UniProtKB/Swiss-Prot annotation:
UniProt feature coiled coil, ranges: none
Keyword Transmembrane attached: no
Organism name: Abies grandis (Grand fir)
Functional note: Converts farnesyl diphosphate to alpha-bisabolene. Involved in defensive oleoresin formation in conifers in response to insect attack or other injury. Involved in sesquiterpene (C15) olefins biosynthesis.
GO cellular component, one term: cytoplasm
Motif (DDXXD motif): 529-533
Result when mutating D533A: Abolishes catalytic activity
Pathway: Terpene metabolism; oleoresin biosynthesis
Molecular function GO labels: alpha-bisabolene synthase activity; magnesium ion binding; terpene synthase activity
Localization: Cytoplasm
Protein name as annotated: Alpha-bisabolene synthase
Binding site for Mg(2+) 2: D529, D533
Cysteine-cysteine disulfides: none
Gene expressing this chain: ag1
Primary location recorded for the protein, binned into one broad class: cytoplasm
């Protein structure tokens, strides 16, 4: 550990060639994304054999005995898979292959073509249906499979095709179809848009075609589905339906996808993946352009996956809420009222429902003060997700291949606030799939979202940043060794731990000085802390505290030897930080730093007076002192004022730092103090130590239990965390890098003190985080 471990690291990724390569990947990605963000190549989505067959059904509008879109028939004839099914070869999903293959077989028969393809398709359907033994054999279901397949299969039956109509699995599907159709509000199909509009081709006996146009989308589609739209067209001759089908053929040539457009969901998925991979700083322009487009379409009624959908989609809306708020757009959680009754969204296909609830769960964590609906949403989504873990569908072959249960479990154990940013990006680089397949009416892919380039850059960029940090850690440990700080054997050496505290969140190459000075101050503080609350006597501390007031090295003659050394190091670190800050900021700051340091150490001294007198403060007194004496304020200032290119006027600084006000540095101090207490108070009790916030509350409330005491401390933390989030994301004219640096240090602090029971900080967890974040590179 420490010096020896760090100087033994020799990362190759520090060489300029690796960053030059990463820059080529960045340019390649910008080019790849340009059509989706700036051009007209939006909605890049794979073919739906199922939907393409429905479009192929449409007869020529001139009344002749041939398809209106003959190119779709040719596509179908040329794209059969080797086993006789139609679908995407890379992924096998039984229900997808069954639906698509039966769909294709029937349209080839309609036009009396493809004898061989039909024969092979029928064989695939028969043989695979006969392999189904029980329900747990069916695997994941494409959207509305239970409704559509029995309908399509009855069409085949009327043609007397050689299919096993009497299989128990087939009877079960008809049973499920009835179960679904029973909850249907039929009169309302015509007045209130609903998810069933996506699949009208499966409920043809139910729909009064003469009434259905009232819920058609503006582009002429029925909920973006080419198949459903084609069906309505064949029954009505509706001109707008035909325009939609034409527009999709024009865009894709000789096939159609199962959803179109997917302009809103695709943009949001692009941004989500770039952010989660940790590569977002290379794509500020593209992310703004994507989110700007989403925001233009953002409205009080929510958003669908496509901007023309006549009903909002929880998946897209929750994802949009989160990314918009995260990028400082003004959104209200009131949009989730669109998904409420008397919450629901427990209808639909399983992966979509799970996705919607994962997105709602994540969105709920970005709550601002007073946003009760998000607390409710968090509770609801958590319950939903824990239930989903217990459902058989979660363990289907398809879901297991994508580690769905693992993903749900990880989401539930992961708090956005209590996250290590660099570590989350590293972990996501290990989960992200370039060939990820999604489910709707058919299995599909979105290549702008899931591709090899994103991951290549993610892994390389992570390794390069890490290698830069490793060189910085050599500098840190080298400075530490020669600094004099190791001479204080009453304190533990933790330079890498403090470097991690800042570097795991504020990682960008240009902020090396920020990280370095932050680390120096944190190393100094840990010695000062031990000196004031443990090692020093009150009379010694009174002397040291007087020296603090005087800012005079000559006055040090009066101090004990160890304090002479401590004062010298402190004095030097304070003024190095101040000089660097004055250089960056172009204004005087020595006086401002000196006052910050005096208030901090005078805080320690008040605390030391209490300890010596065995005085237990009121909780008000304790928190008042603790916000000042915890030391986060002056530590944060020692980093935030020295960020390359980030100018903070006095006016701007006061927006994020102002003792006595609920601004970022104050909220961090408060959260740190109380979070620490929640994590450690029991160890300090059994050690006969200085009272914590818990003990202070119990003195204030002699009748209350320890449990009630801890509960109260949490009732203070939770509101503070919400305020911290709003202060961070709030639109203002404070350089955002500075706000982010403050917030991210808080997030890493919250990781260290998470799950506050008794009981102590986990030294092993800390070491493991440092290993993962700073020591071990990603394999390429
Ligand atoms: C605290 C543990 C588990 C061992 C580290 C020893 C050491 C560096 C003491 C830190 S003093 P601390 O526990 O943070 O209590 P505070 O004065 O910060 O409220
Ligand atoms: Cl996959
Ligand atoms: Mg202390
Ligand atoms: Mg201490
Ligand atoms: Mg403690």
């Amino acid at each position: 550990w420490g010096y020896d471990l760090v100087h033994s690291l020799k990362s190759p990724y520090i060489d300029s060639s690796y960053r030059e390569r990463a820059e080529v990947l960045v340019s390649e990605i910008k080019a790849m994304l340009n059509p989706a963000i700036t051009g007209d190549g939006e909605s890049m989505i794979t073919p739906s054999a199922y939907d393409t067959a429905w479009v192929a059904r449409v007869p020529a509008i001139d009344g002749s005995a041939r398809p209106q879109f003959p190119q779709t028939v040719d596509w179908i004839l040329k794209n059969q898979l080797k086993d006789g099914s139609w679908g995407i070869q890379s992924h096998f999903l039984l229900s997808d292959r069954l639906l698509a293959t039966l769909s294709c077989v029937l349209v080839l028969l309609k036009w009396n073509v493809g004898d061989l393809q039909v024969e092979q398709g029928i064989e695939f359907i028969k043989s695979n249906l006969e392999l189904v033994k029980d329900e747990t054999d069916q695997d994941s279901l494409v959207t509305d499979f239970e409704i559509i397949f029995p309908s399509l299969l009855r069409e085949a039956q009327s043609l007397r095709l050689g299919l096993p109509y009497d299989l128990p699995y087939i009877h079960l599907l008809q049973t499920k179809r009835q179960e679904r159709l029973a909850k249907l509000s039929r009169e309302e199909i015509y007045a209130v848009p609903s998810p069933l509009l996506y699949s009208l081709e499966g409920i043809q006996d139910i729909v009064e075609w003469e009434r259905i146009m009232e819920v058609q989308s503006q582009d002429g589609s029925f909920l973006s589905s080419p198949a459903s739209t084609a069906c309505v067209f064949m029954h009505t001759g509706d001109a707008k339906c035909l325009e939609f089908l034409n527009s999709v053929m024009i865009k894709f040539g000789n096939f159609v996808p199962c959803l179109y457009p997917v302009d809103l969901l695709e943009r949001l998925l692009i941004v989500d993946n770039i952010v989660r991979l940790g590569i977002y700083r290379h794509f500020e322009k593209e992310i703004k352009e994507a989110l700007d487009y989403v925001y233009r379409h953002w409205n009080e009624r929510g958003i669908g996956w496509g901007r023309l959908n006549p009903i909002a989609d929880l998946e897209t809306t929750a994802l949009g809420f989160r990314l918009l708020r995260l990028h400082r757009y003004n959104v209200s959680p009131a949009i989730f009222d669109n998904f409420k009754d008397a919450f629901i969204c427990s209808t639909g296909q399983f992966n979509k429902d799970v996705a919607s609830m994962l997105n709602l769960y994540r969105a709920s964590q970005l709550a601002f003060p007073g946003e009760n609906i998000l607390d409710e949403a968090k509770s609801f989504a958590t319950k939903y997700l824990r239930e989903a873990l217990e459902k058989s569908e979660t363990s289907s072959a398809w879901n297991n291949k994508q580690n769905l249960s693992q993903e749900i479990k990880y989401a539930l154990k992961t708090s956005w606030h209590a996250s290590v940013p660099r570590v989350e990006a590293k972990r996501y680089c290990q989960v992200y799939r370039p060939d990820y397949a999604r489910i709707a009416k058919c299995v599909y892919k979105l290549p702008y979202v899931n591709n090899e380039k994103f991951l290549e850059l993610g892994k390389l960029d992570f390794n390069i940043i890490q290698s830069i940090h490793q060189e910085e850690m050599k500098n840190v440990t080298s400075w530490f060794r020669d600094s004099g700080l190791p001479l204080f054997t009453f304190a533990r050496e933790r330079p890498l731990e403090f470097y991690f505290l800042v570097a795991a969140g504020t990682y960008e190459p240009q902020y090396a000085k920020c990280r370095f000075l932050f680390t120096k101050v944190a190393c100094l503080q840990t010695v000062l802390d031990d000196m004031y609350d443990t090692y020093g006597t009150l009379d010694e501390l009174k002397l040291f505290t007087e020296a603090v007031r005087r800012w005079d090295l000559s006055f040090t003659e009066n101090l004990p030897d160890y304090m002479k050394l401590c004062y010298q190091i402190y004095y030097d670190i304070v003024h190095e930080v101040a000089w660097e800050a004055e250089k960056e900021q172009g204004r005087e700051l020595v006086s401002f730093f000196r006052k910050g340091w005096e208030d901090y150490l005078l805080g320690y001294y008040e605390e030391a007076e209490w300890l010596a007198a065995e005085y237990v403060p009121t909780l008000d007194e304790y928190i008042k002192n603790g916000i000042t004496s915890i030391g986060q304020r002056i530590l944060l200032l020692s980093g935030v004022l020295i960020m390359d290119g980030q100018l903070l006027s006095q006016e701007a600084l006061e927006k994020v730092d102002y003792p006595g006000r609920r601004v970022l540095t104050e909220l961090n101090s408060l959260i740190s103090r109380l979070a620490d207490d929640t994590k450690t108070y029991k160890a300090e009790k059994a050690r006969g130590e200085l009272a914590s916030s818990i003990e202070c509350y119990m003195k204030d409330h002699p009748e209350c239990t320890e449990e009630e005491a801890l509960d109260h401390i949490y009732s203070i933390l939770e509101p503070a965390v919400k305020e911290l989030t709003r202060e961070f994301l709030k639109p203002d004219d404070v350089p955002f890098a500075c706000k982010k640096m403050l917030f991210e240090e808080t997030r890493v602090t919250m990781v260290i003190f998470k799950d506050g029971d008794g009981f102590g900080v986990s030294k092993l967890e800390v070491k493991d985080h440092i290993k993962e974040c700073l020591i071990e590179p990603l394999p390429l």
